[PDB]
Write a protein that binds this ligand. Structure first.
Ligand SMILES: O=P(O)(O)O[C@@H]1[C@H](O)[C@H](O)[C@@H](OP(=O)(O)O)[C@H](OP(=O)(O)O)[C@H]1O
Length: 1565
């Protein structure tokens, strides 16, 4: 730490970064809040603080000292942070100079420091104000209370010193300060330009200098040096987000906006920009706009800043300023901002300017505006549709017609002169070929207009598709496409237009390839490839006729592509290839192609891609087509197996099964005709591997997915058939038919949303919704069957689109329909985990500011503990934000109430998040009436609702809030208990309860509140146990009990009061008297009458007949507790009451539907058992395929060289790292596949070996030492770095487990090369600290969980420790001194001692001091014995070699784990010995080995003495003698008591060298 250096000071308590900013035109120093997930992630150059050290000479700075005076300086402003009097005695405020003693501050180290040495960097400091002799502190109150969502936190001063009030130093890159200084310079130049603008005078040379400044700013913003190209044309692939943020905070964008605005404010005029005088001004505006476009690229915050300036963009539009392109970029970047910005007048302005210019670029701007992220925006598309289809704008659009002249096409276009021309399309194309500029321009304009029409019709917007279809016909488009005379680009534009207008329309609908449900009657007696398609062939034949010619066009075009030697050589041909492939994909997905045609098309599509953005996109689309065709093959196989089952059922029972025959048949289908390619499956593999080698990330991901699926055909088909459902019941079949018809009708209506949204359609769909609500069914079993049928139907998707349909608040009929739809979704999710997961998939739609949607979300999350565990803090933030904004009703609170508890289980993190969010929201959300006036208002409302309370009354809302707080209180959660106790005092509850008139529901809520907030407290609060308000509440409880009993005696009673006394009151009293903490209180002697009267009231409650049997039993338990209390609490029972209490003590002392279904289940089971090994063989084939990729490719090829160099495996590893975040399942599968590659080969039986042989022969031509060689190959390809990076940065438990498993498999066998690679990576890389931190933190958490479990008396945290310890042992295997010493001290800034952590883990698992005492048998059980053995083995591996430092550490550690290690040998471990003696023997042997390793080569006697102190000699000798006798009792096992005793004897001798008594005892007879 030195003066003149800058660091960031972070406050741990506030979890905020100190920043200084000009909030209200005046600089304020504060603790800013950040919405970013990581608090440290959010940082600011303004937040940067420069440290200055006071020294004798003002110029001299020297280096900082803890005692030396420190001054902090806001970097951007340069003003020193200072403490000044606050109107919290003093409040921090910046000062211009350090001359004033206000800036001076004193720093106190949080941790001990060496004398007054120089302050270490990145060290915690305690701030204080030496000037005023006070200590600085942070306050929760914000410095910007006025603004919404205040981020700035005020900082005050206190005389006392607080350890919590300390700030941590954080290093700052010099580049950040250099960028801030250069940004201040850039602001200075911008201010010089602004000064010239304000003066209204700028020389020509000065304006040229401004242009040069803009050019330099362009270079800096791009972060790219000049390439000789125009700064306006400057290109940057990815902007620098840090630089963009710096610009935004510096207001350089604001300066540029002001510079653009001022000339037109005149100095310059937009019309005059055409004049040569203001042409340089126009160029300067252009530079500004280009810089803005580069600045705001892919940054929501920069786009937000520009949004406030969007108006000046609108005004500037219509002139040559490139504002069109900049606006299009920003608007495409953000859609929501586009929704705010869009307005019909801007669409009209675009129309007017594009008409005036008559240029294709303006149309291109609109085309870009229409679509974003390849997804159309409905509102903007509708506005543009109206504007374009307006008859007024007919002139701009080019009209087209077809005339015989066997037919030809002519186009008519209008000039700016308003002259109309008409000409043949072929003649235009030929003139463009000749080179006529006018004809080429009109053809390009027409192409752009065609693309504009397709863009309008994007995402099936019928409103304009109708008119566009009226104008353009299918035959015309087909003729234009087929014609070869026209240019390739125009042919491709026709392809796009056809696809977007006609092929995608209402009559066509997407087809799901595999149908889970089937009809038992429909099941064919026999099935072939033709018969499978025959089921829907008729509809296929009818639909084909419309596009039949286009199908042939597609087929012949793809045939031409495959015929061509070079598939994607020509760019112009590639342009049309993309469109044709996309059209084929769309047709296939809509289902026009038959299955045989799809199988034929697979060969061509794969051959095209068999050994630039457009080519990659085409290959991706081909992959998608292959995916769909494989999905269809799956359903064909399912149908074949179903037909087999039906045929066997018919044969056996005309109305014993030949399962062997059926299995023989099914193995054939699972194993020909159905193959995608005619090469035998080789070509698919080669294409997939080549595409994996390809660079494009989506293409590689898809290729990897298909490659993995290619070798798992059998398992997927078995799973699908297990999911298959058959309809055999007539009633359910009729329901299925009705549901199909109703769903198709509803889906058609939702599709024609535009038609039936503004009639009888509304009533029709209300009726359909009610029909589906009836269809849901009654009864749990019936509901489950109907939910299975619904899942098979996929109606849930149609319902989600119905909800997605746009609407306005005024449409009450539509809101009714939405309510019905929500009820139907509720019925779908009712007690169905699968349906609940499906809803979770699309929950993003459900997240809306609507109470009905919130209730539906509550039902979605109902009773799903896994979903609660994976719940999202952002979702919780959304809910609490809605409550803060409105907090109208109890539904938002009820959602959290449901989240709190699931399956009768609690989640501490969820409860803590709820309470923390409540605290952040503050008193406003948590309404109380504690004050007397608020209590009076509550009393008035309670009196008004005394007869009854509304379901949504504000009193009911407050009650529900209190109930949610009680829900948080449940679970004896000490941490949130603290917040609850601070939240509410017992006195307010006492006042409300003791009020003359209190609502019974309010009383139950408060009794429950006390039941958990105070009785269920994990830690004892002295206040409750010293309060006699409990006895006041108990006399009130007796009054209520008397009221209930007298009511039932009078024959008139209130069920609410009865339940109040029965459940909440009884549970609260029972818990209070059960609490051991309450037993400490001795106020029962003062309130002796009260407690005896409470017992009398409970006895009367039990005696009265109205009490229920369950309530009677609960009351009896409570009365037993009250009796144990009554024995010794200065209370004497009356003798008669004691007679009934003695009676109480005595009481306490006292065609066949089911046949077909079961047969199908049995055949499923039998087939699964039959085919189990074949699945394993098929999976194993992939390991060989990955091992030898070259065999697939032809010998001597370029791809052969690439695979021979190991390209495929290295690319797979690198893409695994790249994709760990994008595709978790794919990453995990790849890691497991690498582990399988590493693992040793194994036989698979006769049938499995036959299958493996056949598969390998078809796919590949034929062309421990092996394990070590494979490990070396993987290490060279880079598995070690992949493992290290995954363990370092992954947040996925599965990914971490798989990474550790891969590390263990790599290092297995103690490979010195892998160990050295790990050491080299650890030493060289800068993240070694991060890796060791991850491992050490995991081990520490495992230790903590083990301690918690021991206190209770097996945890994923403890389970994960086993592979970690195995990994450490394997790293230290073969006595690698470098690794053994590295683990102890990795030589970094922070050193983590994994050896001590392992020893402490052993100690805590064994029980520590209690285990030393000798209760080790109680702690050790069959479950943890393996982990104990592994820990001992790891410690032995650490010690052996020997490593003197490790041995000393283990022997001399403060935990005294050597005592536990010796107690392992000495103790009997009786509970485990009785049942499993082998584990006890193994434990003893490993402990003896560790003890011997500890003293392996130590000549000195310290270690031996320390061991012997714990291990007495006589007991040792007794153990040695006992083992030999135990030999005879030995049962067949690997371990031998004789061998164990021999090892203990060797240890005993080595210890005896030092111990004369042990020597004498060891001497035999
Ligand atoms: O991940 P997203 O959607 O971009 O949102 C980010 C984050 O959620 C905050 O909006 C903001 O942090 P603060 O709340 O600290 O401002 C940050 O901008 P920043 O980079 O200016 O912090 C954003 O980038």
């Amino acid at each position: 730490l030195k003066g003149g250096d800058v660091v960031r000071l972070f406050h741990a308590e506030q979890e905020k970064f100190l920043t200084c900013d000009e909030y209200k035109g005046k600089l304020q120093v504060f603790l800013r809040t950040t919405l970013r997930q990581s608090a440290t992630s959010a940082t600011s150059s303004n937040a940067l603080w420069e440290v200055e050290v006071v020294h004798h000479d003002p110029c001299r700075g020297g280096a900082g000292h803890w005692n030396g005076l420190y001054r902090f300086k806001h970097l951007a402003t340069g003003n020193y942070l200072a403490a000044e009097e606050n109107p919290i005695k003093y409040c921090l405020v910046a000062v211009p100079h350090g001359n004033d003693i206000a800036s001076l501050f004193e720093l106190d180290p949080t941790t001990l420091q060496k004398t007054d040495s120089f302050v270490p960097r990145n060290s915690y400091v305690r701030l204080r104000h030496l000037c005023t002799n006070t200590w600085i502190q942070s306050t929760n109150v914000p410095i910007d209370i006025e603004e919404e969502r205040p981020i700035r936190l005020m900082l005050g001063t206190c005389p006392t010193k607080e350890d919590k009030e300390a700030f941590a130093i954080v290093s700052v890159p010099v580049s950040e300060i250099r960028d801030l200084d250069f940004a201040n310079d850039a602001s200075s130049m911008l201010a010089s330009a602004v000064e010239k603008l304000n003066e209204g005078f700028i020389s020509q040379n000065d304006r040229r200098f401004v242009i040069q400044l803009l050019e330099d700013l362009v270079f800096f913003v791009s972060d790219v040096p000049n390439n000789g190209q125009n700064v306006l044309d400057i290109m940057v692939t990815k902007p620098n987000r840090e630089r963009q943020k710096l610009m935004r905070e510096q207001n350089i964008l604001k300066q540029v906006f002001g510079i653009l605005k001022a000339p037109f404010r005149p100095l310059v005029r937009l019309e005059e920009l055409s004049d040569q005088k203001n042409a340089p001004y126009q160029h300067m505006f252009r530079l500004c706009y280009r810089v803005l476009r580069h600045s705001q690229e892919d940054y929501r915050k920069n786009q937000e800043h520009i949004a406030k300036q969007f108006g000046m963009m609108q005004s500037q539009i219509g002139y040559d300023i490139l504002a069109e392109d900049t606006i299009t970029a920003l608007l495409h970047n953000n859609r929501k901002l586009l929704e705010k910005h869009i307005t019909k007048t801007e669409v009209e302005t675009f129309v007017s300017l594009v008409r005036k210019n008559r240029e294709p670029r303006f149309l291109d701007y609109l085309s870009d505006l229409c679509v974003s992220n390849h997804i159309a925006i409905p509102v903007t598309q509708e506005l543009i549709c109206k504007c374009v289809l307006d008859p007024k704008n007919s002139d701009i659009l080019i009209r087209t017609e077809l005339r015989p002249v066997e037919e030809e096409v002519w186009l008519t276009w209008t000039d700016k002169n308003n002259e109309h021309h008409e000409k043949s399309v072929r003649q235009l194309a030929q003139e463009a070929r000749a080179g006529n500029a006018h004809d080429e321009n009109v053809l390009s304009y027409y192409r752009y207009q065609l693309k504009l029409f397709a863009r309008m019709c994007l995402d099936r917007q019928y409103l304009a598709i109708d008119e566009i279809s009226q104008q353009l016909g299918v035959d015309l488009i087909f003729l234009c496409m087929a014609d070869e005379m026209l240019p390739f680009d125009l042919r491709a534009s026709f392809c796009h237009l056809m696809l977007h207008v006609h092929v995608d329309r209402d009559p066509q609908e997407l087809v799901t390839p595999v149908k889970f449900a089937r009809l038992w009657t429909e099941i064919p007696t026999a099935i072939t490839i033709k018969d499978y398609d025959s089921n829907l062939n008729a509809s296929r034949d009818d639909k084909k006729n419309k596009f039949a010619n286009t199908m042939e066009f597609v087929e012949d075009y793809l045939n031409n592509v495959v015929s061509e030697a070079v598939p994607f050589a020509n760019e112009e041909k590639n342009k049309l290839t993309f469109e044709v492939v996309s059209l084929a994909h769309n047709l296939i997905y809509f289902g026009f192609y038959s299955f045989s045609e799809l199988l034929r098309l697979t060969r061509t599509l794969l051959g095209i891609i068999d050994c630039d953005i457009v080519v990659m996109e085409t290959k991706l689309k081909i992959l998608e087509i292959l995916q769909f065709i494989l999905n269809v093959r799956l359903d064909y196989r399912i149908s074949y197996l179903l037909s087999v089952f039906k045929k066997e059922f018919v044969e056996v029972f005309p109305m014993n099964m030949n399962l062997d025959r059926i299995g023989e048949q099914a193995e054939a289908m699972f194993g020909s005709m159905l193959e995608v390619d005619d090469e035998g499956g080789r070509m698919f593999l080669r294409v997939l591997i080549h595409l994996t080698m390809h660079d494009y990330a989506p293409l590689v991901s898809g290729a990897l997915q298909l490659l993995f699926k290619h070798f798992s055909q059998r398992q997927e088909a078995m799973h699908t058939f297990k999911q298959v459902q058959l309809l055999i019941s007539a009633q359910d079949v009729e329901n299925y038919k009705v549901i199909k018809s109703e769903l198709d009708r509803l889906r058609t209506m939702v599709e024609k949303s535009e038609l039936w949204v503004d009639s009888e359609n509304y009533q029709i769909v209300k009726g359909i919704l009610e029909r589906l609500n009836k269809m849901c069914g009654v009864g749990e079993q019936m509901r489950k069957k109907q939910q299975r049928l619904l899942k098979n139907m996929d109606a849930h998707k149609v319902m989600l689109d119905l909800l997605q349909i746009p609407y306005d608040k005024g449409d009450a009929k539509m809101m009714e329909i939405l309510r019905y739809t929500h009820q139907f979704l509720q019925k779908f999710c009712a007690g169905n985990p699968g349906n609940q997961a499906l809803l979770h998939k699309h929950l993003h739609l459900f997240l809306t500011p609507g109470l009905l949607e919130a209730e539906t979300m509550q039902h979605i999350f109902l009773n799903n503990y896994q979903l609660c565990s994976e719940i999202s803090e952002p979702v919780l933030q959304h809910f609490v934000h809605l409550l803060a904004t409105h907090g109208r009703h109890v539904q938002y609170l009820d959602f959290l109430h449901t989240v709190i508890k699931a399956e009768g289980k609690y989640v501490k993190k969820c409860q803590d998040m709820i309470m923390t969010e409540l605290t952040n929201a503050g008193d406003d959300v948590v309404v109380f009436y504690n004050d007397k006036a608020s209590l009076a208002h509550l009393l008035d409302m309670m009196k008004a609702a005394r007869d009854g309370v509304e379901d949504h009354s504000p009193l009911m809302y407050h009650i529900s809030l209190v109930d949610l707080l009680a829900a948080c209180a449940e679970g004896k959660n000490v941490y949130t208990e603290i917040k609850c106790t601070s939240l509410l005092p017992l006195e307010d509850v006492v006042s409300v309860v003791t009020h003359e008139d209190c609502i019974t529901e309010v009383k139950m809520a408060y009794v429950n509140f006390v039941n958990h907030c105070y009785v269920d407290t994990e830690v004892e609060m002295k206040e409750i146990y010293t309060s006699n308000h409990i006895w006041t509440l108990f006399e009130n409880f007796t009054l209520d009990m008397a009221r209930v009993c007298s009511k039932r005696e009078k024959r008139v009673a209130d069920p609410t009061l009865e339940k109040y006394v029965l459940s909440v009151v009884l549970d609260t009293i029972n818990a209070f008297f059960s609490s051991p903490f309450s037993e400490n209180s001795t106020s029962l002697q003062t309130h002796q009458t009260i407690v005896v009267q409470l017992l009398q009231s409970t006895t009367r409650l039990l005696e009265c007949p109205w009490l229920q049997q369950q309530h009677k039993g609960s009351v009896e338990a409570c009365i037993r507790t009250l009796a144990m209390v009554a024995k010794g609490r200065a209370i004497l029972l009356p003798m008669d009451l004691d007679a009934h209490i003695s009676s109480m003590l005595s009481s306490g002392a006292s065609w066949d539907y089911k046949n077909i279904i079961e047969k199908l289940q049995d055949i499923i089971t039998a087939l699964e058992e039959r085919l189990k090994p074949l699945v394993q063989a098929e999976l194993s084939v992939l390991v060989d395929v990955l091992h030898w990729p070259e065999l697939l490719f032809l010998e001597g090829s370029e791809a052969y060289q690439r695979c021979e160099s190991g390209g495929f495996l290295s690319k797979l590893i690198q893409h695994t790292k790249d994709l760990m975040e994008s595709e978790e399942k794919l990453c995990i599968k790849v890691l497991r596949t690498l582990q399988q590659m590493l693992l040793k080969k194994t036989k698979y039986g006769d049938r499995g070996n036959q299958l493996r042989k056949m598969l390998l022969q078809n796919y590949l031509q034929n062309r421990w030492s092996a394990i070590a060689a494979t490990q070396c190959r993987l290490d060279k390809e880079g598995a070690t770095k992949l493992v290290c990076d995954l363990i370092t940065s992954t947040k996925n438990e599965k990914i971490f487990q798989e990474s550790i498993g891969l590390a263990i498999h790599l290092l297995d066998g103690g490979n010195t090369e892998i160990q050295k690679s790990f050491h080299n990576l650890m030493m060289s890389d800068k993240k070694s600290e991060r890796f060791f931190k991850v491992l050490h933190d995991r081990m520490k958490r495992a230790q903590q969980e083990t301690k918690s479990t021991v206190a209770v008396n097996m945890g994923t945290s403890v389970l994960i420790m086993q592979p970690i310890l195995r990994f450490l042992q394997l790293l230290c295997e073969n006595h690698n001194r470098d690794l053994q010493n590295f683990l102890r001290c990795q030589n970094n800034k922070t050193n983590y001692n994994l050896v001590c952590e392992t020893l402490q883990f052993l100690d805590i698992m064994c029980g520590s001091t209690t285990g030393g005492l000798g209760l080790l048998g109680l702690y050790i059980n069959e479950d943890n014995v393996g982990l104990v053995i592994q820990t001992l083995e790891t410690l032995t591996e650490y010690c052996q070699g020997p490593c003197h430092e490790n041995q000393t550490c283990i022997v001399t550690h403060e935990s005294n784990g050597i005592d536990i290690i010796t107690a392992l040998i000495l103790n009997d471990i009786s509970p485990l010995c009785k049942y499993r003696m082998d584990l006890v023997l193994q434990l003893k042997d490993n402990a003896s080995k560790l003890l011997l390793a500890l003293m392996e080569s130590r000549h000195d006697s310290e270690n031996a003495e320390r061991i012997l102190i714990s291990l007495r000699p006589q007991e040792l000798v007794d153990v040695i003698k006992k083992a030999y006798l135990q030999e005879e009792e030995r049962e067949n096992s690997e371990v031998s008591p004789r061998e164990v005793g021999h090892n203990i004897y060797i240890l005993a001798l080595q210890l005896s060298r030092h111990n004369k008594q042990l020597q004498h005892l060891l001497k035999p007879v």
